[PDB]
Structures are given as C-alpha cells and as structure tokens.
Subunit: 155 residues, 2 copies
Amino acid sequence: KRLIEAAENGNKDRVKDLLENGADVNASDSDGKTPLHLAAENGHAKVVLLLLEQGADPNAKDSDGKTPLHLAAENGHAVVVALLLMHGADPNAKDSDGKTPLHLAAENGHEEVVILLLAMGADPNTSDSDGRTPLDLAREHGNEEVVKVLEDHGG
Amino acid sequence: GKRLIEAAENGNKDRVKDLLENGADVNASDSDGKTPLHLAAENGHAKVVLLLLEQGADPNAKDSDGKTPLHLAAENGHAVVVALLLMHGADPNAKDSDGKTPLHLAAENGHEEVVILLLAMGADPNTSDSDGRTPLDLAREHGNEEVVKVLEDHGG
C-alpha cells in the first residue's frame, strides 16, 4: 500500500524501510499495479533494482494487461528496460490492446529501448489487436532510425 | 579484418554486415589487440555492437591494455552498449593492466547509469585496482557524488 506510493515517487529509502518492516514486494493496487509497475513507469532505476533483487515479479500484469516492461518501454526508460530484461521480463508479453513492449517503444520513437528488446528476443513481427506490427507503428511515428532498426531485424 | 575494424569504429552497420557476408572474421584483431567489438563499444555504436555479438564476437576479448569491450563502453558511459555486452556474458569484474574493472572506470568518469547496470550484473563494488583503490575511492576522488551514494548503498 505505502510501498506502491514510495516506489512511484522514487523514494528508495522509504522503499527499503517498508520491505524491512515486512511489506510485500509483490503487493497490488485495485488496478493490479505493483510497486515495480510504478517505479518502472516513472524511470526510478535504483528503486527498480532494489525491488527486483527483493523478488518483485517483472511479468506481473496490471488491469490493462501491462507489465512493468510495457510501462518502462512506453516511457523510453532504457536502463529500467535493461534491468527488467536481466530479471526475466518477457519482451513479447501482450497488453489488452495486444501490444508488446516493442509496439509501445516503436509508437513513441524510443530507439534505445527497441534495440534492447530486440537483443532479448522481442519478435519484430507480432501483430497487435489492429493487426499492426511494431514496424507499422515506427513508420507512423516517423523516426527513420527506429524504422531502419526494425527492418534490419526481419521486420 | 582491418576493414571490419574501421567500419565497426565508424558505426557503419551496413558495411559491417557486408564484410561479415564476404567472410570477415568477427574476432579479427589489430596489432593493439583491438577487435571490431572493442571499437564499436568504445564509440557507442549500439546497433553495430548487437550485430557483432549475435555473429559471435567475444565480449571478453582483451586488448593490449587488458581492456575488454565492456571496459571501453563503461569508461565512455555508453549505458545501452554496457547492457548489450552484459546480456552476452561480458564479465563485469574483468581487470585491465591497471587492475581496474569496468566498475572502476565507470565510477572514475561519473557514469551513474553504467554503475547501476554493472552492479545489477554482479560487479563487486569492493574490488581493488593495482593501487589498492576501490570504485568508491575513485568515485570520491573525482567528486562524483551521485555515483558515491549508489556504491555506498551496494555495500561499498
């Protein structure tokens, strides 16, 4: 409960003391949001690492089917994405719109995140609910470097 | 091999791919022991780094200074490159000729994101270089306060 708000604002000290007091590393909000979802979304890499080493699930799905990897990828938090991938976050997990972390990174033009996801086996040809691939979204965004990266990985 | 090294240094992914298709050795070395992966990691060419790694480039190949591509990427603060190298098994505790690990080089140059990634992959925060200095001593010496705190929190 308090741990979720402490991970959200990137308050590492308050996160550390709440788990020392016995707070569940995998505690969930009414929206299925865990402390790892919010720290990942907000780009708090140090908090993300502490949560991961304490056993936080990098594949926990919220009510939108989004994992902390979806949220970090969407926001272009490259270091956070790398930390999640290192701890076994699925780069092909689909949200409620059928979008993988790669679809969200490509849509928002996050080249570094796209590279990291592809390196960890993200399928560049996965179709979302509208039948669109991350390449289709990268072309809609217009960043030609992301377009090129996806094309080079068999997109 | 020589053409592959310069192309990897320039970040020319298409020329790198063309040379590998023509039979260029992924692990070709210069007279200084620098491989195409050493130069692509040093110059921060993440896309070239990924292509080289998937084609079998050694992330632990040592140059004449005992530096691996991880040392060079960590020293220059290339976070994405560091993450790519770590994913492919680069040793975060490898020592160069000065006894410095990539963590010593990252801490010396104030590269906080690189330090976080190295620590996450098991880099020992208390390794001593040839002068008996730890990454914390080097982070302190060069006034890198953000790096100092991170190292202290990881048992430094």
